From Swiss-Prot:
Assembly with partners or alone: Interacts with RAD54L2/ARIP4. Interacts with CRY2. Interacts with RANBP9. Interacts with WDR68. Interacts with SIRT1.
Modification after translation (UniProt): Autophosphorylated on numerous tyrosine residues. Can also autophosphorylate on serine and threonine residues (in vitro).
Source organism of this protein record: Homo sapiens
Domain of life of the native organism: Eukaryota
Name this protein carries in UniProt: Dual specificity tyrosine-phosphorylation-regulated kinase 1A
Family (UniProt): Belongs to the protein kinase superfamily. CMGC Ser/Thr protein kinase family. MNB/DYRK subfamily.
Subcellular compartments: Nucleus; Nucleus speckle
Tissues of expression: Ubiquitous. Highest levels in skeletal muscle, testis, fetal lung and fetal kidney.
Length: 335
């Protein structure tokens, strides 16, 4: 009775999996920790709800994960490994390798004061390599839900990360879901109802990397109008050539007699472009809240390279927004 599978700690499925506990829940269903007796290892089992819409998303996730696993690059190891899938008690079950804390858990463990720029750079370098993998023409996968929660440590005392959850994903040119991206990480082009490509994931990554170092969301909107207003505080009014083509431009902006755009009033924001990323990152003032003052690996030069890469990932124009190959060549990553 209901969407969920009933799970009692202690049960053993198909005399292969011993169920230990429920790690977590989500929109899609349940994740349980279990021991795979034939592979001799812990696995995370994603149990999809018995409902057409969740079954359908999971069936795309299986196809995209099996497509990615076919590739013979080392870059594929930045994406969670789907061991197996099977039907059991009327639920699609996806058997994953067992990973560790998500990046949101990391932030919580720092009490939301942020991780070091040194660890930020290691996460950024791996995420740019994962996005470069996804942009493989034969893949051309848009994750569509990048957020700190969907990026997991492989092991709790190492820097190595992987991306999870391709439930909302599509391939270049597809339009499947009415709304896409988690609101804090949602690109201007999705807010504006414009066509979206792999650049929307680069937008999400920019936002994620700032949060990981400051401890707080860059753009914490409570609704789409609040989201776009918080973006404008930092980045200014979007270019006219974008707003002139945007189906939902008039949800956030008004075009003036001159042909200049500015913000609609809502019916309490800093003037456009005056909440500088330079001051959010504390480039010249000791990093976020001054907390990194003196500390090694937190110099003005380091911060300027970080700021400059983030602003290339947060370009309003998805045609000119930095692409994964060029992001990897950035001075921020030089040894
Ligand atoms: C030790 C604590 C558990 C670590 C872990 N290993 C995981 C492996 C895969 C997935 C996962 C994969 C996909 N494609 N979609 C979702 N939604 C979750 N999730 C994992 N998790 C997180 C637990 C889920 C709350
Ligand atoms: Cl709204």
């Amino acid at each position: 009775r209901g969407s969920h599978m009933i799970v009692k700690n202690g049960e053993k499925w198909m005399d292969r999996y011993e169920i230990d506990s429920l790690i977590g829940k989500g929109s899609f269903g349940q994740v349980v920790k279990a021991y795979d007796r034939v592979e001799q290892e812990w696995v995370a089992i994603k149990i999809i709800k018995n409902k057409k819409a969740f079954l359908n998303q999971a069936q795309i996730e299986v196809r995209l994960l099996e497509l990615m696993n076919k590739h013979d690059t080392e870059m594929k190891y930045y994406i969670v490994h789907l061991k197996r899938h099977f039907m059991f008690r009327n639920h699609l079950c996806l058997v994953f390798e067992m990973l560790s804390y998500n990046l949101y858990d990391l932030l919580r463990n720092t009490n939301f004061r942020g991780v070091s720029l040194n660890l930020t750079r290691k996460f950024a370098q791996q995420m740019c390599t994962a996005l470069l993998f996804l942009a493989t023409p034969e893949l051309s996968i848009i994750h569509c839900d990048l957020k700190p929660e969907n990026i997991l440590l492989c092991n709790p005392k190492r820097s190595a990360i992987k991306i999870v959850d391709f439930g909302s994903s599509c391939q270049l040119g597809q339009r499947i879901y009415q709304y896409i991206q988690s609101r804090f990480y949602r690109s201007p082009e999705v807010l504006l109802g414009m066509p979206y490509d792999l650049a929307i994931d680069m937008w999400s990554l920019g936002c994620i990397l700032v949060e990981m170092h400051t401890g707080e969301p860059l753009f914490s909107g409570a609704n789409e109008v609040d989201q776009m207003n918080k973006i404008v505080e930092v980045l200014g009014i979007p270019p006219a050539h974008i707003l002139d083509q945007a189906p939902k431009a008039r949800k956030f902006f008004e075009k003036l007699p001159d042909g200049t755009w500015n913000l609609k009033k809502t019916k309490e924001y800093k003037p456009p472009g005056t909440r500088k990323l330079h001051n959010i990152l504390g480039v010249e003032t000791g990093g976020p809240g001054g907390r990194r003052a003196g500390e090694s690996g937190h110099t003005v030069a380091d911060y300027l390279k970080f700021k400059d890469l983030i602003l290339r990932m947060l370009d309003y124009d998805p045609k000119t927004r930095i692409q994964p190959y060029y992001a990897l060549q950035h001075s921020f990553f030089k040894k």
